[PDB]
C-alpha cells in the first residue's frame, strides 16, 4: 500500500498527512489487501471534498465525499470505501 | 513555347480556367499541347482542437492546390496579347515562362 | 566547449578591467556578465559576480582562465 496525497487549493500539513495514513491504516487489513492509493483533497468555496482511488488485485475503486472541515470529509470517505471493499471481497470468495 | 503554369485551390475552378485558355489558343493560332494535369500539393495541418488539455482531441485540415499546364508549341502574336487581359474567375494564379 | 573563434568578454567589464589594473587594485567589481570568460588580464583582482540575488566575491587566481565568471558563482542553494 502506497499513499499519494495531493491537494488542490489545500496545502497539506504534517498533522493532516498522518491523519490520512492512520485512517487509511484502518481500511487496510480490516477489509482487503490493496496495491496503490491516490488521495485528492479539494476545497471549492464551501465543500471540503476528498477523493480516493484504490487499486486492488481485481480492478480499481473510487469514492468521493464532501464534508464539513476536511476531517469529516475523509471520515466519510473511508466509510464509503470500506463498504465497497467488503462488496468486492465477497465477490471474490463465493464459498 | 510559353510554359503557362497555373495553380488554384478549387478543382472545379481550375478546370474551367484552363478551358477558357485552350479554346482561345485554338480560336486564333494553333498547336496546343493540352491541359496536362500535374501532381497537386496536399499541405496537411494537424491542429489541437481544445483551448487547453486533451492532446488526443485534434482536427486535421488540408489545402489541395491543384495545378495545370498548357505548354503551347510555337507562339503567335495574336494570342500573346490575348493571354493577357483575360484573367477572370479570381482564385487562379498564372505564371508564364518563355 | 564552444565559440571556436575568440573568447567572449563584455565591453562593460573589459574596459572596466583596464581602468582597474593600471590604477592599482580596486573595489570588488560588481558585474552581472556571467557570460564572459576569464582573461589573464584580471589575475589577482576581486570580482563580484551576480548569482541571482547577491554579488559573491571571487578572487581571480592564476588557473581559472579556462573558465567563465558564472561558473564560480552558484545560483541555486541546496540544504
Amino acid at each position: 500500500m502506497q499513499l499519494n496525497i495531493t491537494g488542490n487549493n489545500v496545502e497539506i500539513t504534517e498533522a493532516l498527512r498522518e491523519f490520512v495514513t492512520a485512517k487509511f491504516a484502518k481500511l487496510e487489513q480490516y477489509f482487503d489487501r490493496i496495491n496503490q492509493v491516490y488521495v485528492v483533497l479539494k476545497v471549492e468555496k464551501v465543500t471540503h471534498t476528498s477523493d480516493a482511488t484504490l487499486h486492488v488485485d481485481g480492478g480499481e475503486l473510487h469514492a468521493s465525499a464532501e464534508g464539513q472541515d476536511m476531517y469529516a470529509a475523509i471520515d466519510g470517505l473511508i466509510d464509503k470505501l470500506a463498504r465497497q471493499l467488503t462488496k468486492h471481497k465477497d465477490k471474490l470468495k463465493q464459498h | 513555347r510559353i510554359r503557362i503554369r497555373l495553380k488554384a485551390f478549387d478543382h472545379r475552378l481550375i478546370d474551367q480556367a484552363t478551358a477558357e485558355i485552350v479554346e482561345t489558343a485554338k480560336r486564333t493560332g494553333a498547336q496546343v499541347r493540352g491541359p496536362i494535369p500535374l501532381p497537386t500539393r496536399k499541405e496537411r495541418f494537424t491542429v489541437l482542437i481544445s483551448p487547453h488539455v486533451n492532446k488526443d482531441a485534434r482536427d486535421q485540415y488540408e489545402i489541395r492546390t491543384h495545378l495545370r499546364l498548357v505548354d503551347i508549341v510555337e507562339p503567335t502574336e495574336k494570342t500573346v496579347d490575348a493571354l493577357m487581359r483575360l484573367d477572370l474567375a479570381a482564385g487562379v494564379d498564372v505564371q508564364i515562362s518563355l | 566547449r564552444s565559440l571556436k573563434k575568440g573568447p567572449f568578454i563584455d565591453l562593460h567589464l573589459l574596459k572596466k578591467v583596464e581602468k582597474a589594473v593600471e590604477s592599482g587594485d580596486k573595489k570588488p567589481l560588481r558585474t552581472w556578465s556571467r557570460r564572459s570568460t576569464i582573461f589573464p588580464n584580471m589575475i589577482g583582482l576581486t570580482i563580484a559576480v551576480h548569482n541571482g540575488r547577491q554579488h559573491v566575491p571571487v578572487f581571480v587566481t592564476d588557473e581559472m582562465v579556462g573558465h567563465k565568471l558564472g561558473e564560480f558563482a552558484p545560483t541555486r542553494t541546496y540544504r
Binding site: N35, Q36, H55, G59, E60 | T46, D56, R58, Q60 | -
Partner: protein
Amino acid sequence: NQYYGTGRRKSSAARVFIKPGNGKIVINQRSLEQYFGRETARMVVRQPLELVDMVEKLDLYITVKGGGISGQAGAIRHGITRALMEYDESLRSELRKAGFVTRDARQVERKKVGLRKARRRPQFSKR
C-alpha cells in the same frame, strides 16, 4: 505476338509482357536469380505457372517499380495472371480456384490520432 497485363499489389505496380519463346524471365534487365531468386517467397512468381505448364514455353520481360521485395513479387503474380488474356477462361476458370487474380487490396492503414501505429493505444495502466 506480345501480350500485356498490368498487375499491382501493395503500392507497387508491375508491367509484364509475354510472347512465345523459351523459358527465360528477365526483371528490369536482370534475371530472377540476381533479383530475388532464393530470397523471401522465391516461388511466388512461378506459382501461377505450375497451375499451368511453363517449362520452356513462354518467355517474358517485365519492369516493376515501387514497393519492396515481396510487394513487387506479388504484383508480378497478379501481373502475369493478367497477362494471360489471349488464353481465356479455359485457362482462367480453374485459375480462380487457387486465387492469383484477386487484387489483394490490403493497403497500409493510415496512422490515426491518439494511437501510435493505427491500432496501438498508448498503454493506460494501473501498475
